[PDB]
Amino acid sequence: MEALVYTFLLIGTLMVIFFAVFFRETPRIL
Amino acid sequence: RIPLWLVGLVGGLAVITMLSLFFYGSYSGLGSSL
Amino acid sequence: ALPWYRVHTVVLNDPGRLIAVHLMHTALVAGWAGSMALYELAVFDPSDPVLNPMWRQGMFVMPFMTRLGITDSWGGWSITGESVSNPGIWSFEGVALSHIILSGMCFLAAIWHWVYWDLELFRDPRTGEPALDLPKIFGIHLFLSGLLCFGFGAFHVTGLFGPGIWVSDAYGITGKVQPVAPAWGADGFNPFNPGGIAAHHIAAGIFGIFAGIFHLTVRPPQRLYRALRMGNIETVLSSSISAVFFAAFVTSGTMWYGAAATPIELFGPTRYQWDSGYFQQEIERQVETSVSEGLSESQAWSRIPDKLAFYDYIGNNPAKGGLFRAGPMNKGDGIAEAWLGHPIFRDKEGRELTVRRMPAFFETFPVILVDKDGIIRADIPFRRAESKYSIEQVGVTVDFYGGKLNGQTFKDAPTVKKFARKAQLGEVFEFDRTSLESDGVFRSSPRGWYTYGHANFALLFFFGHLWHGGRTIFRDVFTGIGAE
Amino acid sequence: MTASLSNFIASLIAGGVVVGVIAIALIVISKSDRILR
Amino acid sequence: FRWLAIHGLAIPTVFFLGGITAMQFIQR
Amino acid sequence: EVQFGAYLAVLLGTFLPALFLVNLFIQTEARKAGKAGGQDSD
Amino acid sequence: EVQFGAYLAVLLGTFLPALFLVNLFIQTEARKAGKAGGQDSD
Amino acid sequence: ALRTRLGEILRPLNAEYGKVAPGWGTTPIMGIVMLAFLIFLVIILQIYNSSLIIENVDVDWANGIV
Amino acid sequence: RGLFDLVDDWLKKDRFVFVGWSGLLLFPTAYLAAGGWMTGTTFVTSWYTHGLASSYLEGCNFLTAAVSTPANSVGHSLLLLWGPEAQGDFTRWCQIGGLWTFVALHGAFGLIGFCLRQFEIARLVGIRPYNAIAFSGPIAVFVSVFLLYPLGQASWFFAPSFGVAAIFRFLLFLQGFHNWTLNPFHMMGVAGILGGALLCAIHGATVENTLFEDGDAANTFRAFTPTQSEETYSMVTANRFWSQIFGVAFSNKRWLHFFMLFVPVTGLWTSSIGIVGLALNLRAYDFVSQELRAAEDPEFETFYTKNHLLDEGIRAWMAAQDQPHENFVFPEEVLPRGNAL
Amino acid sequence: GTFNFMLVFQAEHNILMHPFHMAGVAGVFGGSLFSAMHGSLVTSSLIRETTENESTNYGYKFGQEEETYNIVAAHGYFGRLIFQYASFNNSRALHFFLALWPVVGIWITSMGISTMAFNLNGFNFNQSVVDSQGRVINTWADILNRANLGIEVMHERNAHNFPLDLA
Amino acid sequence: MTGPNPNKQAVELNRTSLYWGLLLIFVLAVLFSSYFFN
Amino acid sequence: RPFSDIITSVRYWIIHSITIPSLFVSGWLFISTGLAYDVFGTPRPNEYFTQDRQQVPLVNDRFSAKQELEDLTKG
Ligand code: CLA
Ligand code: CLA
Ligand code: CLA
Ligand code: CLA
Ligand SMILES: CC(C)=CCC/C(C)=C/CC/C(C)=C/CC/C(C)=C/CC/C(C)=C/CC/C(C)=C/CC/C(C)=C/CC/C(C)=C/CC/C(C)=C/CC1=CC(=O)C(C)=C(C)C1=O
Ligand SMILES: CCCCCCCCCCCCCCCC(=O)OC[C@H](COP(=O)(O)OC[C@@H](O)CO)OC(=O)CCCCCCCCCCCCCCC
Ligand SMILES: CC1=C(/C=C/C(C)=C/C=C/C(C)=C/C=C/C=C(C)/C=C/C=C(C)/C=C/C2=C(C)CCCC2(C)C)C(C)(C)CCC1
Ligand SMILES: CC1=C(/C=C/C(C)=C/C=C/C(C)=C/C=C/C=C(C)/C=C/C=C(C)/C=C/C2=C(C)CCCC2(C)C)C(C)(C)CCC1
Ligand code: OEX
Ligand SMILES: [Fe+2]
């Protein structure tokens, strides 16, 4: 049952990495 | 006045000689497993 | 546009809301202390103070209430076993409820001081800007600290107008709260002398009163005001953080090494009493005076109190737990019920063998029986093939003395091997591992947990001293430096 | 009083000497190598 | 004068190196 | 068998500090939208 | 003995919808502070 | 800005601000008190360390009166 | 003018080696700590404390020479030369391990004096004291490992000795007896140190490969002036490169260089927290749910349970030699072995 | 499994006594030292572009041409911290040294693992210090050897049938 | 209530800091869960 | 004065052609005369074990450590 928590934490970490890459704040000049 | 590369020559030859004695002493005398 | 780690700097130059923000920390700390004690009273079992004391049940704030005098509860029990008629207000429950009421009063005061931030008292009459005279505020608060330090020493600890503090004998058998006379000689600096606690708080309380008198009347030097930045309130935060990690390293030291301020009936034994064989030597010394006065071996060992035998067991060592083995010590091995007695191992010729005890470094340890000369005579072999000191060869028998197996001999090597495995953990006790559903791995005591938190807090607070001290001295360049 | 206590007091003196002989040498070199004006 | 700051390191170094060089010819 | 209080320690130890930072980021963007002055300020 | 998943159901069922509403209220006040234009807008 | 009844009692205690004694003041006396405090902490460290052994000071678990 | 001001002028004088007020503490204590370590690894034995040869006089090389910890019998004694164990005798002081506490205590005040030096120079140059903040990492490592860890243990004996292979023993002692790799605070330390060496290599190579053409030589080191105001490398090109290679790039040079400070210092501070826990044996030793399952199911094997058998090998095969004061006599029949080894 | 890999490698190859792992440790200890050093001196010498309320990182604009920190002030600090001749005034030489030290250190320790793959092990100083009678005086390498012996008699405990782990 | 407080400041957390903190809390939860569950 | 112009001057090598070999010889004589064994208490190769003591000598007492070491180093 704790493997449900382990899977959710790892898949939840990869979803943060997805949004950090493709929904990043674009660096803009001026 | 001495050329600076001549000092680094005999200075490096002294460091080579002393480290050769430290590596010789690993094969002879104390700590040599002999 | 403050960053998240700078949000609380809005009360840096707002003395009314700094008081409000400190009253809310005070409300949360007192509210923790009231509700932690109420939780601990809901799970405490006050029925066997001998073999289930407060440090076996994971009580953390309960030893600090008992150290200064609170022994009774409203439920009619004490931790000394003395049944009580009416404790009055300051039971365990009434102290917890008073910390809760103090929490709610500091909470309402924090709301008032936040809402009414613009008091004329916080203004500088020379400039009109919000200023705190930190040299005189220190002189006020040092003088009150001296009156509270002196009054705690003179009235509470000496029992003039107080209950005294917890004192015990040298082996933690009979302990009580009683008034403590101060020790003014060099033995007041012996930290196991309880009279040094009274003599410290009287003498340091007098020092804090009259340095508080000095700091109330004498302005700082002009050189020291500029060097130590005494107009900046962050110079006080730097030096207070330094004074508080200093004090937390001291409390971690005296908890871990032992002191009169950390008694073993409230916090448990130390790791050094197991290493030195402190309770084992006293248990022998009581037995040998009993066989000197014409008693048998079985009668001598039956005179040993089970509270004394319980201290001589490695599951009560605070250095035997784990960082994530959570909960009371009863969650590890069970709730202790009865002393099984002292095993004496003998082989066929008849001299006594003793099992070499497990040191506190070792999670696992080989079962080994030595004689009085330390020579190996028997063991339990890992590899059984060319084994020569197995218990089946040597023919080791075990006799128990005292306890619940008091006159009983075991000669068959299966049950001698079962008793040799438990004899390397010290004195053997019968446990109840079904009430808490105990797992079988030792936990740490509250003495070990206190030292963990407060030595890790003191290390983290050393960084806060470096940060806030560097932020004080370098205040004119913390938005960056000038290029010219 | 004891040998351990007399050795401790001797170390406060010897500690104060090596603090002293550095400080005295630091005063007299700060007067000799002072910064011209 | 910067003498006794570099000579506090250099004088024990040459003394120690003369000792360690003599140690290579010590036999048991 | 694992410790049952660890389900609370992990999931509240994840969600409550994560929702605190989601709270801080959202009010940062809402404060920028209010200062921008158009159609999202109100 | 009570059901151990109910500690998660009650505490996450309290905290996560409560912190959602605390999130919505705080960004409402931050959007008003940004539109107000002084000392809290940035 | 708000004058309260308790605020007028405590008002002279916050009335000075930045008032200094001139020059070096009592800093020589402060350094002597700090030095004796350093020696005092070294004493009680070494007693408890048993690097300082004093007569009739046995650093070991003692019998408080019970 | 004043006598304090003449000394403050002389100590802060711009010379070859800056002294300062902090040099009154740093230069005595760091010289005795370094010189005490050279004296111990050259001349002083460990024959009476550990039963080891640990100096060049006994045949040790640079890897196996150490200043070893004192004997276990002296406990946590300060081992002052005048103290009640050596009683002024310098020869007996070196034989009971007094040079260890000499090096460790004068080295502790050298690290205080060096961090005070970083505060003092930054106040005179007129910059922010972030280098002194970053040195709190190495200070927290030394305090927690060399002082706080043996203070929670039985004696100074279980501290790391000041040698190369003696430190290697301390690494393997704390695996066998404490399971220190399993500790999540060491894991955060490994992430900060490997993350710091990664940040050193990436930032070093990104700057060096996004340089501007500022000269005609193929040797690009000549095309930089230390007083120039232009950036010597293209941050826009460097951000463009890593945004397409890695997905995420630095856009702020200030946040980049703070992050190069933050990662290794956090790694040294988090690993110092878990080694304070090992001082009290509050170790991350066992996952009890896997230990309980493997107890009642003798095919449940993980790489976790395989590591516990390695630790029981370490604790039995090294304990007689590594704790010789304890007189551990293990017969060969009780030593845990696998088959045929 | 990574920690199991490390311990068995130490028992079978003595990687701690291999100088290529020693250069790798100097690569990652030095590399995180130089990362914290270079990151300190840039952050110490940032130029005033912000107020006390906003973050210090908002003093840098992405795409700006000017330098964001006083490298003369950082060189004058580190030149007084140790001594003047031991500090990089060239920022291109400094960032090259930041690239070279961990990369060469990790290259060498990668060629330690690759050469301990063919059992060219780390230094063996077991029973190398011997007194006049001939008896073995132990060293710290011998206590390290007792920990190597404990791993190797317990690793892969059912896999071995013969007295030498030649695999 | 006394006057409006002049020390009132705004708080920021940009999207980079949100991703860094979401990553930190999830990775600390990934790391420490095995120890809490024991 | 600069550094590299010192060590290339011949006055530097007039001084240090005497002082450096005299310190190297004096370090050699610190070992050759056996003085370093008596100063630091390091055992010579003869004296790890004596005729009475065939075991490894350890100190087992804290406050008589000076006197226990004198009995272990008498032979
Ligand atoms: C109104 C008075 C009051 C009284 C009588 C108590 C009484 C108690 N408190 Mg409570 N408490 C109070 C207010 C009070 N509290 C407030 C206002 C707070 C919020 C801050 C708390 C927060 C609190 C917590 C968190 C806890 C308690 C606990 C306790 C119990 C144990 C006390 C103890 O061991 O502390 C020992 C006290 C000290 C060791 C104080 C150290 C003082 C240092 C050394 C001063 C050093 C600085 C000084 C200024 C230096 C100069 C000195 C000068 C003289 C030279 C005891 C029943 C404990 C408990 O058991 O809860 C159930 C507990 O855990 N209290
Ligand atoms: C009648 C006179 C009298 C008597 C009998 C006492 C008695 C005592 N004093 Mg008190 N004291 C007095 C007057 C007196 N005092 C006066 C007038 C003052 C000035 C106001 C003090 C100020 C004072 C302080 C500051 C301390 C005492 C302490 C003590 C206790 C010493 C025993 C002990 O447990 O310390 C244990 C031994 C030490 C704490 C040694 C201190 C050395 C420190 C810890 C070094 C480490 C510092 C470093 C930052 C930490 C990290 C180091 C390393 C881990 C990295 C003992 C009860 C100590 C105490 O409260 O202990 C619980 C204590 O810290 N007293
Ligand atoms: C000084 C701080 C302190 C100390 C020393 C203690 C000590 C104790 N507590 Mg108490 N407690 C405290 C504060 C403290 N408490 C506070 C502030 C609370 C309110 C939250 C409590 C609430 C509490 C309860 C409900 C109970 C205790 C219990 C106990 C006892 C058992 C300890 C244990 O098993 O921990 C287990 C080990 C740990 C908790 C590990 C500590 C955390 C590690 C270091 C990781 C650090 C956090 C990590 C980085 C963040 C997670 C990442 C996240 C993203 C998931 C022990 C005497 C138990 C007891 O026996 O009572 C009868 C018990 O049931 N405590
Ligand atoms: C009594 C001690 C004390 C006090 C009053 C302060 C006060 C302050 N610190 Mg300092 N500091 C301290 C100790 C203290 N610190 C310690 C021990 C450390 C080392 C960890 C630091 C390291 C430090 C740094 C690096 C910085 C500060 C900053 C600040 C200022 C703003 C804090 C803020 O807004 O964060 C807001 C905090 C949050 C939004 C959430 C933080 C959540 C933490 C990480 C975990 C949760 C904490 C938990 C609930 C409480 C556990 C109780 C435990 C502390 C006993 C404020 C003046 C900042 C500053 O200088 O501003 C200019 C700053 O940059 N502090
Ligand atoms: C009178 C009586 C009685 C007589 C007794 C005699 C007596 C008193 C003797 C005492 C003598 C005594 C011992 C005194 C000497 C004092 C002394 C030195 C003692 C200390 C002991 C000791 C051995 C110290 C050695 C330690 C030491 C100095 C080590 C440092 C080694 C060193 C060269 C390090 C450099 C490392 C390095 C190259 C790092 C740079 C890399 C890096 C990332 C830099 C970052 C960086 C750099 C920049 O540059 C700029 C620009 C920027 C941007 C930037 O990012
Ligand atoms: C195959 C090719 C594609 C590559 C795959 C993509 C993987 C990219 C990983 C991105 C993670 C983003 C980190 C969020 C944070 C974020 O988005 O930051 C974005 C940030 C942009 O910074 P700026 O300079 O814009 O910030 C200025 C201010 O905003 C500062 O707050 O860049 C950095 O600071 C981070 C660079 C180091 C990036 C470190 C990555 C950490 C590695 C991942 C660790 C987690 C692994 C967990 C596994 C379970
Ligand atoms: C208002 C009011 C009232 C009420 C009050 C109350 C009811 C209170 C409560 C209070 C409370 C009830 C409180 C509590 C608190 C708590 C706390 C504050 C806690 C915290 C915690 C923490 C902080 C911790 C953390 C941690 C962890 C978790 C882990 C480990 C680490 C640490 C330790 C860090 C009254 C009626 C009287 C009066 C009137 C008013
Ligand atoms: C302990 C003590 C003391 C002493 C101290 C001192 C003063 C010392 C010093 C010492 C010293 C200070 C020493 C030093 C030495 C050094 C050495 C011995 C070095 C060596 C080196 C080497 C051999 C290296 C090599 C190399 C080279 C050369 C180059 C190339 C590379 C290499 C790295 C390889 C006293 C008196 C206080 C008393 C108390 C105690
Ligand atoms: O697979 Mn992985 O570790 Ca290379 O040695 Mn043979 O094989 Mn197994 O044993 Mn040991
Ligand atoms: Fe850079």
GROMACS .gro file of N, CA and C and ligand atoms in nm, chain C residues 183-193 195-205 207-208 242 245-246 249-251 254 259 261, chain H residues 37 40-42 44-46 48, chain I residues 143 147-148 151, ligand 2:
model
  200
  247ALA      N    1   2.509   2.445   4.777
  247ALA     CA    2   2.646   2.402   4.804
  247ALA      C    3   2.740   2.512   4.757
  248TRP      N    4   2.800   2.583   4.851
  248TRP     CA    5   2.875   2.704   4.819
  248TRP      C    6   3.023   2.679   4.795
  249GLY      N    7   3.073   2.560   4.821
  249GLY     CA    8   3.214   2.531   4.804
  249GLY      C    9   3.251   2.500   4.661
  250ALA      N   10   3.357   2.423   4.644
  250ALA     CA   11   3.393   2.377   4.511
  250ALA      C   12   3.304   2.265   4.463
  251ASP      N   13   3.234   2.196   4.553
  251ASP     CA   14   3.144   2.090   4.512
  251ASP      C   15   3.012   2.142   4.456
  252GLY      N   16   2.988   2.273   4.461
  252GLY     CA   17   2.879   2.328   4.385
  252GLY      C   18   2.900   2.328   4.235
  253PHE      N   19   3.023   2.307   4.190
  253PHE     CA   20   3.053   2.294   4.049
  253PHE      C   21   3.064   2.150   4.005
  254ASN      N   22   3.051   2.057   4.098
  254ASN     CA   23   3.024   1.919   4.063
  254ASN      C   24   2.883   1.914   4.007
  255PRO      N   25   2.865   1.877   3.879
  255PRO     CA   26   2.732   1.885   3.818
  255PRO      C   27   2.637   1.778   3.863
  256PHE      N   28   2.684   1.677   3.933
  256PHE     CA   29   2.596   1.577   3.991
  256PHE      C   30   2.552   1.614   4.131
  257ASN      N   31   2.607   1.721   4.186
  257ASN     CA   32   2.560   1.775   4.313
  257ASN      C   33   2.436   1.858   4.288
  259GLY      N   34   2.292   2.051   4.499
  259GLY     CA   35   2.310   2.177   4.567
  259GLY      C   36   2.380   2.282   4.484
  260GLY      N   37   2.448   2.241   4.377
  260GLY     CA   38   2.505   2.338   4.287
  260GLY      C   39   2.402   2.411   4.204
  261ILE      N   40   2.285   2.349   4.184
  261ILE     CA   41   2.178   2.414   4.110
  261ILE      C   42   2.120   2.529   4.190
  262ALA      N   43   2.100   2.509   4.320
  262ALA     CA   44   2.055   2.616   4.408
  262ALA      C   45   2.160   2.725   4.421
  263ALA      N   46   2.286   2.686   4.439
  263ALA     CA   47   2.392   2.784   4.458
  263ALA      C   48   2.422   2.861   4.331
  264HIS      N   49   2.402   2.799   4.214
  264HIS     CA   50   2.419   2.872   4.090
  264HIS      C   51   2.314   2.981   4.075
  265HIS      N   52   2.187   2.944   4.089
  265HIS     CA   53   2.080   3.037   4.060
  265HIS      C   54   2.069   3.147   4.164
  266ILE      N   55   2.122   3.127   4.284
  266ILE     CA   56   2.130   3.236   4.379
  266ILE      C   57   2.244   3.331   4.342
  267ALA      N   58   2.361   3.276   4.311
  267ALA     CA   59   2.477   3.360   4.283
  267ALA      C   60   2.467   3.425   4.146
  268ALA      N   61   2.430   3.349   4.044
  268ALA     CA   62   2.410   3.408   3.913
  268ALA      C   63   2.287   3.497   3.909
  269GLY      N   64   2.189   3.473   3.995
  269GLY     CA   65   2.076   3.562   4.004
  269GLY      C   66   2.113   3.696   4.065
  271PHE      N   67   2.418   3.819   4.041
  271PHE     CA   68   2.498   3.880   3.934
  271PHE      C   69   2.409   3.943   3.829
  272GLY      N   70   2.299   3.877   3.794
  272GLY     CA   71   2.208   3.934   3.697
  272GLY      C   72   2.127   4.050   3.748
  306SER      N   73   2.371   3.349   1.934
  306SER     CA   74   2.495   3.292   1.984
  306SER      C   75   2.483   3.246   2.128
  309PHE      N   76   2.257   2.909   2.110
  309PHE     CA   77   2.318   2.782   2.070
  309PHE      C   78   2.426   2.740   2.168
  310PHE      N   79   2.490   2.836   2.235
  310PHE     CA   80   2.582   2.803   2.343
  310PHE      C   81   2.509   2.726   2.451
  313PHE      N   82   2.407   2.368   2.341
  313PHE     CA   83   2.515   2.271   2.346
  313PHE      C   84   2.541   2.225   2.488
  314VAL      N   85   2.516   2.313   2.586
  314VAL     CA   86   2.534   2.278   2.726
  314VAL      C   87   2.426   2.182   2.772
  315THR      N   88   2.300   2.211   2.735
  315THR     CA   89   2.191   2.122   2.773
  315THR      C   90   2.200   1.988   2.703
  318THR      N   91   2.487   1.807   2.922
  318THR     CA   92   2.447   1.757   3.054
  318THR      C   93   2.336   1.655   3.045
  323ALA      N   94   2.368   1.462   3.470
  323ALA     CA   95   2.389   1.566   3.569
  323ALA      C   96   2.284   1.548   3.677
  325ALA      N   97   2.073   1.777   3.717
  325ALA     CA   98   1.959   1.832   3.645
  325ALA      C   99   1.896   1.734   3.548
  734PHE      N  100   3.516   3.570   3.308
  734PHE     CA  101   3.412   3.477   3.266
  734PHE      C  102   3.467   3.368   3.177
  737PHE      N  103   3.641   3.133   3.410
  737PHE     CA  104   3.541   3.059   3.486
  737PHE      C  105   3.482   2.945   3.405
  738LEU      N  106   3.459   2.967   3.276
  738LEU     CA  107   3.405   2.862   3.192
  738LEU      C  108   3.509   2.755   3.163
  739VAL      N  109   3.637   2.793   3.159
  739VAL     CA  110   3.744   2.695   3.142
  739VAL      C  111   3.760   2.611   3.268
  741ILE      N  112   3.506   2.526   3.492
  741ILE     CA  113   3.398   2.430   3.505
  741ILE      C  114   3.392   2.334   3.388
  742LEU      N  115   3.454   2.368   3.275
  742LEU     CA  116   3.472   2.270   3.169
  742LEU      C  117   3.568   2.161   3.213
  743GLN      N  118   3.683   2.201   3.269
  743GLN     CA  119   3.786   2.105   3.304
  743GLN      C  120   3.755   2.025   3.429
  745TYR      N  121   3.438   1.912   3.493
  745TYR     CA  122   3.347   1.814   3.437
  745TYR      C  123   3.416   1.723   3.338
  906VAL      N  124   3.343   2.043   1.296
  906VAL     CA  125   3.289   2.045   1.431
  906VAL      C  126   3.208   1.919   1.458
  910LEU      N  127   3.477   1.676   1.644
  910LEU     CA  128   3.447   1.709   1.783
  910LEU      C  129   3.317   1.646   1.829
  911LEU      N  130   3.206   1.673   1.761
  911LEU     CA  131   3.076   1.632   1.813
  911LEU      C  132   3.053   1.482   1.802
  914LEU      N  133   3.239   1.305   2.091
  914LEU     CA  134   3.185   1.347   2.219
  914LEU      C  135   3.056   1.274   2.252
 1386CLA     C1  136   2.801   3.007   4.414
 1386CLA     C2  137   2.854   3.016   4.294
 1386CLA     C3  138   2.813   2.927   4.183
 1386CLA     C4  139   2.800   2.781   4.176
 1386CLA     C5  140   2.826   2.677   4.281
 1386CLA     C6  141   2.755   2.762   4.037
 1386CLA     C7  142   2.734   2.629   3.980
 1386CLA     C8  143   2.724   2.599   3.852
 1386CLA     N1  144   2.730   2.682   3.748
 1386CLA    MG1  145   2.712   2.888   3.764
 1386CLA     N2  146   2.756   3.088   3.759
 1386CLA     C9  147   2.770   3.161   3.870
 1386CLA    C10  148   2.772   3.112   4.008
 1386CLA    C11  149   2.774   2.971   4.047
 1386CLA     N3  150   2.743   2.872   3.965
 1386CLA    C12  151   2.783   3.306   3.847
 1386CLA    C13  152   2.799   3.413   3.950
 1386CLA    C14  153   2.776   3.318   3.701
 1386CLA    C15  154   2.783   3.441   3.616
 1386CLA    C16  155   2.643   3.493   3.601
 1386CLA    C17  156   2.760   3.178   3.658
 1386CLA    C18  157   2.750   3.154   3.513
 1386CLA    C19  158   2.742   3.017   3.466
 1386CLA    C20  159   2.739   2.974   3.325
 1386CLA    C21  160   2.743   3.039   3.190
 1386CLA    C22  161   2.730   2.827   3.344
 1386CLA    C23  162   2.729   2.803   3.479
 1386CLA    C24  163   2.717   2.659   3.505
 1386CLA    C25  164   2.716   2.607   3.646
 1386CLA    C26  165   2.706   2.461   3.673
 1386CLA    C27  166   2.842   2.398   3.647
 1386CLA    C28  167   2.832   2.248   3.644
 1386CLA    C29  168   2.786   2.213   3.505
 1386CLA     O1  169   2.694   2.136   3.487
 1386CLA     O2  170   2.851   2.275   3.392
 1386CLA    C30  171   2.886   2.200   3.277
 1386CLA    C31  172   3.015   2.256   3.221
 1386CLA    C32  173   3.013   2.351   3.127
 1386CLA    C33  174   2.883   2.404   3.076
 1386CLA    C34  175   3.142   2.406   3.071
 1386CLA    C35  176   3.124   2.530   2.983
 1386CLA    C36  177   3.213   2.523   2.859
 1386CLA    C37  178   3.134   2.537   2.729
 1386CLA    C38  179   3.018   2.441   2.728
 1386CLA    C39  180   3.228   2.510   2.613
 1386CLA    C40  181   3.157   2.483   2.480
 1386CLA    C41  182   3.106   2.610   2.413
 1386CLA    C42  183   3.085   2.593   2.263
 1386CLA    C43  184   3.018   2.717   2.206
 1386CLA    C44  185   2.999   2.471   2.237
 1386CLA    C45  186   3.049   2.388   2.119
 1386CLA    C46  187   3.179   2.318   2.153
 1386CLA    C47  188   3.199   2.194   2.068
 1386CLA    C48  189   3.088   2.095   2.095
 1386CLA    C49  190   3.204   2.230   1.921
 1386CLA    C50  191   2.705   2.455   3.823
 1386CLA    C51  192   2.565   2.417   3.868
 1386CLA    C52  193   2.713   2.590   3.373
 1386CLA    C53  194   2.582   2.522   3.351
 1386CLA     O3  195   2.478   2.583   3.358
 1386CLA     O4  196   2.574   2.381   3.324
 1386CLA    C54  197   2.447   2.319   3.314
 1386CLA    C55  198   2.722   2.698   3.274
 1386CLA     O5  199   2.720   2.684   3.147
 1386CLA     N4  200   2.734   2.912   3.563
   0.00000   0.00000   0.00000
